Amino acid sequence: KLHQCGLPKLMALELFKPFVMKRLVDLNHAQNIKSAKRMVERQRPQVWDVLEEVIAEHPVLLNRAPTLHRLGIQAFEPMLVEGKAIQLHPLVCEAFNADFDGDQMAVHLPLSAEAQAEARILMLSSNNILSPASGRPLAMPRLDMVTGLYYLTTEVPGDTGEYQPASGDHPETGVYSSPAEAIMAADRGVLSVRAKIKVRLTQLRPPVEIEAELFGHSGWQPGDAWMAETTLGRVMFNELLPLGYPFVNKQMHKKVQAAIINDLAERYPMIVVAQTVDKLKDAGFYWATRSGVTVSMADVLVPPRKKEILDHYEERADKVEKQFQRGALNHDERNEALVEIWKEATDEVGQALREHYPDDNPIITIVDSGATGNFTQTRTLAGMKGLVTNPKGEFIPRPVKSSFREGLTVLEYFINTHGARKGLADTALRTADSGYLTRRLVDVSQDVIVREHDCQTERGIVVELAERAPDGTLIRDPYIETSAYARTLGTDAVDEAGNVIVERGQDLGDPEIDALLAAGITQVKVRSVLTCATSTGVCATCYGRSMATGKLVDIGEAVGIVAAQSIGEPGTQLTMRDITGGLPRVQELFEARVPRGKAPIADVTGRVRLEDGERFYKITIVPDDGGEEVVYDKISKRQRLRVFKRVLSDGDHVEVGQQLMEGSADPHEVLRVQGPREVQIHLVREVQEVYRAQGVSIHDKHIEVIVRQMLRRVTIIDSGSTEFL
Amino acid sequence: FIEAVDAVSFTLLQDQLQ
Amino acid sequence: SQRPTLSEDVLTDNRSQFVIEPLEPGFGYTLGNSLRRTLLSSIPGAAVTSIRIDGVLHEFTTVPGVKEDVTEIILNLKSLVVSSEEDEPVTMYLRKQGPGEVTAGDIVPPAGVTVHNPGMHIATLNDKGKLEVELVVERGRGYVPAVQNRASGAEIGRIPVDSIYSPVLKVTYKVDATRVEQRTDFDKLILDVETKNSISPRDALASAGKTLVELFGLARELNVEAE
Amino acid sequence: LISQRPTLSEDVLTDNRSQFVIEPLEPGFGYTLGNSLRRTLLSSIPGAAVTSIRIDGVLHEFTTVPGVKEDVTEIILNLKSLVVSSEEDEPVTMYLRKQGPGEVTAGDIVPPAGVTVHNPGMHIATLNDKGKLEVELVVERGRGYVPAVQNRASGAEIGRIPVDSIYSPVLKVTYKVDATRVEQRTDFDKLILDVETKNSISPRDALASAGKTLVELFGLARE
Amino acid sequence: QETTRVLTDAAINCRSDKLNGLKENVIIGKLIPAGTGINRYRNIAVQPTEEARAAA
Amino acid sequence: NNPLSGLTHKRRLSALGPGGLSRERAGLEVRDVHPSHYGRMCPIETPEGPNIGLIGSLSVYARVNPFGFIETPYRKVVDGVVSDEIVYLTADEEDRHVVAQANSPIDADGRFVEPRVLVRRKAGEVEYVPSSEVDYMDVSPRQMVSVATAMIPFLEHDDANRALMGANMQRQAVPLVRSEAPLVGTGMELRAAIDAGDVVVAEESGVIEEVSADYITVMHDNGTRRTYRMRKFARSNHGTCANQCPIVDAGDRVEAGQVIADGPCTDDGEMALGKNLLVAIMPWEGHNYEDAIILSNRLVEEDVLTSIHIEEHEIDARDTKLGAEEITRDIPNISDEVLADLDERGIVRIGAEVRDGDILVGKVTPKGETREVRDTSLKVPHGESGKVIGIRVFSREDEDELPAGVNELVRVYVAQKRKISDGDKLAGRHGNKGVIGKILPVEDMPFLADGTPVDIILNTHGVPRRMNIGQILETHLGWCAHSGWKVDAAKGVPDWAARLPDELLEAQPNAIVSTPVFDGAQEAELQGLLSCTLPNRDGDVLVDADGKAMLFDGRSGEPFPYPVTVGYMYIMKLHHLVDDKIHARSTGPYSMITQQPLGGKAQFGGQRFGEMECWAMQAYGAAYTLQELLTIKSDDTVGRVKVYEAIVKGENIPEPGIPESFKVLLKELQSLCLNVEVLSS
Amino acid sequence: SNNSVPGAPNRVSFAKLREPLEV
Amino acid sequence: GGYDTPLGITNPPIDELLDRVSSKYALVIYAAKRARQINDYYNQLGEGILEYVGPLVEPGLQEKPLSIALREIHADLLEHTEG
RNA sequence: AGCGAG
Ligand SMILES: [Zn+2]
């Protein structure tokens, strides 16, 4: 069970040796402590009887080095196991990042009553289902369980015992009196667990519409009945969810399970969520086996049009090579042309492959269901490997045309080796770089502890939150779950002198986002850590909701370390792609290092005059006021200027701080010319952009905590009269 | 790499004399 | 072999959770599966197999005079719980009139048949309408799909329906590892059984045990003095 | 309703392996019963296998007897393939002797009363002019797999050489089911089981013992 | 990091740590001022209610 | 722990060492695979740790110039006639000329068919070049793989990382007690073994006279004779056994260079690192979740996987000022129950089983001032056990060389026949690693139509994304090898078998085959082979043409509704056995500079609760747990005894004090002339 | 092939080409 | 009450327990102090009566004092005052 | 010095 972990008796005996002696001496198995010591050292049989008793309700901390994030350490109830290996509940694997391929994990024993209370309440496995990073659940069905659920809950049209509206010959012959009848029929070869049937559900809440229509307002559903055109597999699945959850009636693609578990956690107590994920794990494991998802050479089907399109693209490659032989273009030009043409070739081959595979193929079933793997891996498996990176970083223009199924030839394998080796070495070094960045972040932001219920301040950043479309529409801004949720309002929302929609000082969750979007309001003022008006550490409300708990933070949470660790753990996932754009860019931003290409930024409004100077660009910003004509001349002509609604069209009225050139902006100059609010917004924006290039979801508020710790000192120019430099 | 039964024992033996 | 003790825990009057421990290292499954399947498909029972409704010859959309259409009548009569004492099929008739609700209790059972839930709603007859239906009851074992009508001319109004002969509706089993240490990982079989109100789950389990003890006694009847 | 009671016919493919046909079973039933009998046959058919051996010139499994081409552990590994049968549960003992060149076979063991080796032709060791093999084995009744019991665990002296024992006469068990599912729905399952034992006991008795253990176990649930 | 520089600077300035940080209290092995170590939660006093004493 | 590990330790190019670079200065540039490595180094086989690319292996054909350069052979084609003069080129010469790929359409006469072929140029560039231009061709494919990587069948389908890992772990497999030859391999299974030197090789051709486990005496062709003495149960440098078993009889005639006796991992000369196990590729009830492997209990019953780990415990009696150490039965006060094992010399009798806490060599140490001797006998460490293989003795009275002051030295060998246990690591030849999550009983495992239990199960969600489907082809060919096939030549020969050589159209069951590294069993040939496999016993082909069978769920009985990919895969037991991994501590030795617990399994030691863990604890807010994890459990010299006393007597756990290591820091700072003072007032 | 080893097992090979030089 | 029966380390349910205090840390210290008091009472029961009292609820089979403390917290038999 | 997990 989720709150349980195995323990080999040959280890539990040694760990609990201090305790077993007591429980056996007082049981008179021995007559003194020393005699009990003998019993333990002799491993005499009676110990295994007393041991099993002195271990119950005695949590132990499981740890796995590296402890990247807060979830690395989790307290489990130990139960005796035979063998020599710590049995680990599979669900928690994603929390530990563990994969049973030789991983070693450490058990620690909390002794003191305070420590045992900490283990039971704070750190227990079942009390921690949501990642502190962004609230995405970690103890949710993954990998094998996802495939099992996807097989169970999908709907294949044409399976055994469909629901057909037959007439004359016979009635529908698809309805079933109760899911009991459905399972009884499915036991024999009459019904399949992925066939469309009309069941009479009587223990599950229908979807919102069915309940609201049939029963109107308050139709309880522990004892009523209703028709459902579902699949028996889906009914089996929905019996796993609590009694109150509306019937879902969908295909449990991994995102859907994430949404389901998130909904459960947000609304239902923690025990219910833990039990629900336990039962989901059980059903997933049970059904993945019958899913028959296996891999075989007959199940890896090469596309049928491979040779012809490859020949055509090779003919184009030969044409460009002939052009090179005539000097029509330089060697870099022909390298780029070949790379681009072969990229088109890879796109076409992948498209044809994805077209050819029917959905029932095990590989496409694994990939589509979100169990694991990306589609490009399947393209390599039956397709072509595509371009291969030359060790410097360029692209070998051959490129590989043989699929791993068809078997690479010698030189193509030797070429692929470059990419493999460089990937491994990059991972090895980037792990250390990430560790160091994590240490620095933890040290900067350790003092940030929630130590006050309320600032009662009035400031606070604003959020775009689905700005209006050019034609007119509240298209949701892509970044809401990482910049809008889990905040406290600094204002009250009113639309066109309308009624107050949401009140100040209240937790902002998804229902309020839907309410705001329905209302017609996008700009919102929200309390944030940046504007926290507290002395020592941030206050509770300015911080907002805690991801792991889902409620308002306590008044002892060391949110600074949580922010540092949640910002550091994604590290070792950002691959470097001159201005840096990978982890070293995040390092530069947090460290506040001057960027490489200092794209000059405007200093004042007004029209701008641009000239393509001799090897550089001369730009003069007409100051709207009587300011000095800010003129910049020493700029490399290679870099292109900022583009916008035009590439800095001569005469543009760029604001007093708009980046003129396209490149990187020094945070120091941005702070100087726009102020702390703007520099905070810019820093969080850039860091979020870097982390989101790899599709990582981390709430800003961590990054805002770090930025707040960065901007807490002031440089003085007037000595005053009190020992100030 | 260069290197509680007896301590606990000595306390216990003094008590046993008690 | 430590005595495989069997204990029971009632959760409802017609729903039980039996637990059998401690079994041999791996026998837990053998038990659980054999029981489960036999319970489901070894206790004879009866249910309505076919129905004829007045005025139903080509149209099956609905029966005039009753709000419930054909599908409701057949799916509810699926749930109708009847016990029988005669092996060959028997014919029931139901007649009702006037506003109100037609209920299971209206059917008069002759000798050898009975209804264990007479008070179950069947349909709603309104507008001074009349509802006359005939049913066929048969005893059997397991779950049999609706039988296709072989002779179209023979059965003008016959509407064969799926019949849940088996008197147990849901049985499911799990295994555990009671006292893994000193007993070295014996099995603990947890059976959850839910049966219609005809018989208590105790009776169903006892009958399953009877029949399977006999079935394996057949194998026993090859060498009486076997070890 | 079906009242016809099930049957148990048998087709003896050979002295070792034999088929058993059970019919007419209820729909969707044959697989469950087949697997139950299969698990019983693979698990809990009591038999006999060598539990320990002793050699005069040896003190443990890691060594070489003078003259033999096969080391001691290879000898235990060859003896693992012995098939025997005991009519008494006490730990009986048997002797084996050989001098001079030539091979040693199970047929050259002199079992005491009751026990007997059913595979005389198996190959143990290849003694030569200087070879002299004198090994005494211990056999006992039992069930399933059991690892070697340590000398220290019992009062055994240095000489004894424990060997893990495999009391399981059954060798390979499978089944098939040919369901009828006729249009009229008079259907049944005709289980066809196939058992193959390692010559230690004919399959009839193996299946009979499986049935006996199963009847008692389900009898407990019945009451 | 830069232990030598930090130590020399602290020695010259005659700085005085106040032991009010997580890392510090960790080094000297007293309760960190986070979570259960804060004064509010660390100083909770528990005694059975009046009815509990009555039931005794 | 292998012969392959020994062989591959040789032929190893270590870029780090004296006069060379180091890890700190080794950037990504020096670690890549420079395109001149082709044939002069193994692009695939490198360690995964902090040595990636710094420690490679020599290629199979590579040769060393006297100047220290690494030559490779090449065949000189002279205007479309691939000749036979194997000329050795260096990197520079190879860059000068133009070299063609190893596999090319040679038209049985030395000329090419395709107008242009794949070809390497000066700076490693790969292109097409007119056929007449080519002047050099590789001797053969697999010229660019070391000994280890060259034994991975179907290497041409494995992504380089999985091949790297598999080539690494082939050097880790423990030598079993059978060591069956692999059912699918390459041409390297033989030469490698013979070059490893384990197998005794006929120095000269002759006629066998006397065969015995200890030694073999062979009559040479001319009067003389030679006796080869065999190493039986000799300890290996990593604790594995080094058995050698003869495979000849008294009457055989041995030719010069023949393999006379098997090594630790050899099987009639071939390299046998593991076993052919019947594998299914279905996800079975989650026990094989996230790389975990399920095993049949058959592998334990039949002893398919089992290693003989031999240990070495040594003690020496020395002369001290208070007296002279002497091992004997006359131990200080002790019960007679513990001298049973010891012989008259006070050392454990050979063959006597020993377990944790038992005495191996009694020893009494001159007690002097405060019996004239205290107790210092060598007790076998915690968690060990097994039989005493052998006892070696060195005595001063025997005028044997010993360190000064050592009156005597004794070495005790204890060997344990370690079985396969859940938690232990298994892996194939494709880096498809995993621990043994559960060892099911033989009954409740999937079985085929005729009741053959599957001996292993692998998760399906580790084949595709790892891009090592080579193992799938491996197990397909393995099934074809186990069952045996027969191509039906009713109408000539099938087209797919056109390129297939004779002697492969038919093959008896368990006919070992070979699929060389980069040229081998094509997909079409494998499909055709699978299409016609001889029925095992009856008219029943278990595996269809797709390679997937119908598996009967052994746990419930009903068949699995869809087929399963079953076959015969070769897997080996890696030397990461749990019995050497597990460890606990409750109170053990403590260091002396700081009173923290020691660290290591050789001692008791604890487990380093480092800094990242402390950050995790701070993040949770758990303060008391952290405090006791850093104060009473490890450092508070007064705290440890008091808390132990409280636990044993059951009182409450006392309040933690001040870490000692903090006191040591304070004292060091004070000894650094920094007046670091403390006050609370 | 031949394997040129006086006692090697007759392990059949799929090799489509000859090896001019033994290892 | 829509949850399955809690068993082992998860009985009492944590949410119903959190309702007795403001935040989880308060619960941890509250339960741990009560557990300390139980342990001292059980140890010093050998000699005369002393100010520590309890357990209020009926202990189970050789339970760890902390479990009894948590049971008492759940049953609402306790009262805590914060610093 | 070598190796395992990330
Ligand atoms: Zn605030």
Residue numbers in the entry:
A (entry chain D): 437 to 1013, 1023 to 1090, 1097 to 1176
B (entry chain F): 438 to 440, 447 to 461
C (entry chain B): 4 to 230
D (entry chain A): 2 to 224
E (entry chain D): 1227 to 1282
F (entry chain C): 443 to 812, 830 to 1140
G (entry chain C): 28 to 50
H (entry chain E): 27 to 109
Manuscript excerpt for this entry:
RNA polymerase (RNAP) is the central enzyme in transcription. In bacteria, the core enzyme (subunit composition α2ββ‘ω) catalyzes all templated RNA synthesis. Promoter-specific initiation is directed by a dissociable promoter-specificity subunit, the σ factor, which must bind to core, forming the holoenzyme (holo). Here, we present seven distinct intermediates showing the structural details of M. tuberculosis RNA polymerase initial transcribing complexes and promoter escape, using a de novo cryo-electron microscopy approach.
Based on the RNAP holoenzyme’s original structure, a promoter escape mechanism was proposed. It suggested that steric clashes between the extending RNA-DNA hybrid and the σ-finger would destabilize the interactions between σ4 and the β subunit, while interactions between σ2 and the RPitc would remain intact. This would allow RNAP to escape from the promoter, eventually leading to the stochastic release of σ as the contacts between σ2 and the TEC are subsequently broken. Meanwhile, the structure shows intact contacts between σ2 and the β‘ clamp helices, as well as between σ2 and the − 10 element, with the conserved A-11 still flipped out and bound in the σ2 pocket. Subsequently, interactions between RNAP and the − 10 element are broken, ultimately facilitating complete promoter escape and resulting in the final formation of the TEC. Therefore, the RNA/σ-finger clash results in the rearrangement of the σ-finger, β‘ lid, and RbpA-NTT, leading to the dissociation of both the RbpA-NTT and σ4 from RNAP, ultimately disrupting contacts between RPitc and the − 35 promoter element. The concurrent loss of RbpA and σ4 density aligns with the finding that RbpA helps position σ4 on RNAP and the − 35 element. Next, our series of structures shows how the extension of the RNA-DNA hybrid within RPitcs can result in the disruption of σ4 and its anchoring of the − 35 element to the promoter complex, prior to the disruption of the − 10 element.
